[PDB]
RNA sequence: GGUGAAAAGAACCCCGGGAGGGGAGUGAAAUAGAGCCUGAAACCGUGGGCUUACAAGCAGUCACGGCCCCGCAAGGGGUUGU
RNA sequence: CAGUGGAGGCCCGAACCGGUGGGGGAUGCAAACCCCUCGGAUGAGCUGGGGCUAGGAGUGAAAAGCUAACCGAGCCCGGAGA
RNA sequence: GUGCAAGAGCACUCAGGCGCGCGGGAGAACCCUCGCCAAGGAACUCUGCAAGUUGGCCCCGUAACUUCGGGAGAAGGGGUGC
RNA sequence: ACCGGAGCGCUGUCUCGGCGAGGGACCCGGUGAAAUUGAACUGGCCGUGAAGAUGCGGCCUACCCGUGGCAGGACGAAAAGA
RNA sequence: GGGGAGGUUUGGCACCUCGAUGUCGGCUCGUCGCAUCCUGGGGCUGAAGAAGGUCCCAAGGGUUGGGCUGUUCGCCCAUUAAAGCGGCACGCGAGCUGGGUUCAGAACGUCGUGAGACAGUUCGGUCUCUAUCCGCCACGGGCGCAGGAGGCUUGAGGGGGGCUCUUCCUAGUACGAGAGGACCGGAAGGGACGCACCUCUGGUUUCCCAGCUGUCCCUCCAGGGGCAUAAGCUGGGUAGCCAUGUGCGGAAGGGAUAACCGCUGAAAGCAUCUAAGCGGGAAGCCCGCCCCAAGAUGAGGCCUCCCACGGCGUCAAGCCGGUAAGGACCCGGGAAGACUACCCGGUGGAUGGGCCGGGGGUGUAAGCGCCGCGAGGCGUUGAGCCGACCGGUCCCAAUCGUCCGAGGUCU
């Protein structure tokens, strides 16, 4: 269960083998591995993780370039992948082979308060026969008397936007050193050039 | 996007000429059809002397519609129309005679008499 | 790293720059296939075409031709599984590229409304045998 | 005067907690540079000037 | 994800072209003047835009411009001694900043335009 | 309905467009200041003394606790943690 | 038959009447309003002015509708502090 | 005043008059009013309510029936610009 | 313009909804009501009770207050029950 | 012929409610119950196999689309592995529908000498914008966490998700007279559903481009402007938003078990699947997965980073003024957002705008020569313009600068 940091970019269907394939590109890049974590001081096993250079001024203090290696940290700090103790240096993106499966997480975008429709799913109906008073509507909620109270978390309109999600079992086909780009079967959750997350999918292991 | 209260056309000699979509095959909740697609239809427009009459309920198979499909290699093709091919409750062609372009996607779904025929296969 | 447009042009080693020019207007001869329990085809198909979608990467046309039966609408992916395709006779003078009008009235009107441009012909006849001309000059 | 109706009446305490989180808001002044006064940050002040100073015709 | 995309609004869209248009001539009179900070922002822009086809001579912009204006007389001072001078100037022609009070009555953010050369 | 015994019903400066005020000045009294005697309560403020940000309530009652203000003692009031 | 001629509780449709199917409005712009659409549309047509017919009475192409925004008997005042 | 079959219709505009006694930012869910829709075509619904197709003027052409008036703009189609 | 049944064409009624539009909604500034109102310090179950509880027990979730939003309940408001 | 249970039907009672408790069904939203319709499993079989009959356990998820009737009911059509029954005011009108119902009209049949009346029918007929409290779903502000700043975390507890069909191989072998027609494992597609995404597909774009109409006006020509929506009309349409489109999710495995199937074994010399012990065994329980999440008042863990006396508390906790790490104010903003917050950048800077290039959108313009008396046309030409966009550029807006910020409890 391996894992590598990443910048989304590219999308499109590149016709490998003849077919097409929705071609989801990550850049991984440098991305450092600055520091582990043992059981009995932390309780697990991870190792932290940086990225893109551009850092002076407005970072300083603690750094980490404290540490016990420097380096200087990124622009786009750094973040943790568990039950991964690798071999020492920054690691860039060939962690994983081109015909292997992956899992992936990373922010969804932003869609703010939204209408139940288009937020968990509901119907809304009468656009004409009934009124126009309740076109994007929820309708009912809870019983009459008894209960007589609203459902713990019976779905409601509001937020679906700014989260975060995990997505498992996506196929890379290539991946190039020489620009540190990973080329995956299009499925990228998030916008083109924020923050994502690669590591080993699961299967039967 | 095939769905029942459809009209389609038959494209041989059958007996009939133009049939209403009813049902699908399909998982029972799949209210959707398209090219190589198993339909139940109610025949509704027939010529005189034929097979299949004017009312008739028969089997049928997709081979041209309006909405294209993706040819996984992303090349898509549509016939301006809803044509389809009578088939029996023993899945066969009934008749003999086609009529224009149907869509090899029917050849790996297990109609190669269609293909066969079929004289412009695409 | 930050140009993923360059990104997305460096992956261009999955480009057709060899196929003959064309506009929204006619097109016609072949393209490639499949067909069979073990490929093995290449069905050739002509057309007049529709739309010209850019993209850069795969930027597909939509081709209009009618047959035997009725008129069908074969769109292709410009880069890779259409081997050679090449066209017949180009046409044009087309107003929009877009050319939706056709699908409802397609007769006469369609040869009623298409000229193709001598000029495209002239440089035709030019590059024919200023080929062997360069075949001969350097 | 429609369906939904103040059922009985909202306490003192309570008006005074909705506007607890009302409540008054600070303005922020800086001083003006080749100048003598405050004014909003990145401002011009009609005493003061940002550069160069256009106007400042006050009597 | 609604106006991930730009532009800001409040009119109609015939009532807003026409808005920046007036803007931009009562500007191209002047040159220095009083407006609310968005519509001295969108204003800037489209203005300077303007500006830089002044840059030009061509008959076709010249037009396309007054086109978009309307004085005669302008076209000729837009091309005789306004975009001349910002002739060796490639860029925000303008430069609108903020002033103090707030617009009286209900208090908006004020800013102001200038020729800046 | 009701300034005051009486108009003596406020000159002058001062901030202010004014409105309204701050002194002067009026007289027993201006906490009698002009729809002005006497000014209950609800009523909305202001300062200050006790208390409250792990908290389940007809809101108080009894006890015990601390904090503050009184009381010569002993007593007492204000408060609310339990 | 042709031409003439221009009849009509005629036909399509403004101004002018109405108020049908919906949407909105519902402490409204409003004690009936708007927007869409609708039916008459030279006739039993509509319209300004003057004038009269009224409470067990009038007026009624007839619902017990109108008679001063609430009509199975108006409104007011009086027996009546029934 | 200009144009459309014409006209007190309608779109622009003459003259004349006005911008409707709160605005400014944002550019949420929702709601009012309004536009585009793939592919399917009343499957929706109590009901094609709604909204849409149809749209003016010249030409072709019109069933059963009938009280010879109609039913008829029946329906179906063909033009129109310069 | 009256109540059924069918047909064709036609279309967001529908499958099944997706952008868009202005205007409200939402934030700054100016004015600023209403019905209702025993007092509140107003969470959930499981039982009780003049039979349907934050308020009674047993028994529950949780720092103090707020902005936008939905509508089960407060036997919700208007009606001294037609 | 007896005994019980359930509280859905149909009733007997008349206690909350006559200063109000809006009665049918459908739209929307469900949630739970199991005496389970389907999907797992097992026992029995008048069970060869196939498939079925029946009982026992098991709610995880699923329970389709139409015709007719206002009708839930039901009948029918096409199907499905399947088309489950029931509670919650026979769920849900401060959420809709008002079609049904028991207003005044009218009629109909009908009863009545009649006025009107009839669980007899039919036609029309006004659901009242602002949520105060509780609750639910989204978001902040105060305080907190018994030094002060940042950055990376741990997972308490909970939530979500858990489906499922056909096809080929084993083999037409086993069984079986045959017809039929298998377990066991394996392979390939399917549909429904959840998740996220513009790449392909397709709809979108409020002035991105074009063609046009009547017009008014700049300026007679061309040319150009507004009006026709709140784009006049259409042909098209980048990004950004999307579903039909697109890649994925269920899993595989672990642990304990039900019903049930078993092993060594007694009491009770035999027998037993049990009272001691061990094994198998379910879509079900716990996990493994996704997400939240230390207000997990218990406020945890990790990586660092800054630090005393400066004035009243001498000894006891405070208190007060600027500082250290820093934080914030204003700004340029953002695939972030009702506001707030969250993200980033502020001249040492590419944040918005202008600009240049790029893609892309649109499709040979304004004008110039050239033909037809003319509309128009050939060419100059894939031109001109050009909204979001991939970038380059300090040309202009992020000037200057303001204030909060440890003085480090005790045992």
Known sequence: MKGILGVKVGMTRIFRDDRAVPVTVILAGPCPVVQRRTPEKDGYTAVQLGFLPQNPKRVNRPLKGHFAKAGVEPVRILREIRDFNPEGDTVTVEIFKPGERVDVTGTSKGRGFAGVMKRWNFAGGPDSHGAHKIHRHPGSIGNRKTPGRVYKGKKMAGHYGAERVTVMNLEVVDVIPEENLLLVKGAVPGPNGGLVIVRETKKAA | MIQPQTYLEVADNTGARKIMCIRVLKGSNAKYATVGDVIVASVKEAIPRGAVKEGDVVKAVVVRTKKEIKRPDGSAIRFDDNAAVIINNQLEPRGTRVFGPVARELREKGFMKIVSLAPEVL | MNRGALIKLVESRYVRTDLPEFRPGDTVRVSYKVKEGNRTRIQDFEGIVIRIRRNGFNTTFTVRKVSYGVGVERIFPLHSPLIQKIDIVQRGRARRAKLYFIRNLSDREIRRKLRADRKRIDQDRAAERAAKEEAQKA | ?59 | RHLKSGRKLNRHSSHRLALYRNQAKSLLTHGRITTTVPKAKELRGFVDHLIHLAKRGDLHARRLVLRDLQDVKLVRKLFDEIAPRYRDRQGGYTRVLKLAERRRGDGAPLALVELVE
Do not use: F, I, N
């Open chain 4, 1 to 59: 005067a429609k369906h939904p109706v103040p059922k009985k009446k909202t306490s003192k305490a309570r008006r005074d907690a909705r506007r607890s989180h009302h409540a008054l808001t600070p303005p922020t002044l800086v001083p003006c540079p080749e100048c003598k006064a405050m004014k909003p940050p990145h401002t011009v002040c009609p005493e003061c000037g940002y550069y160069a100073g256009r106007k400042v015709l006050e009597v």
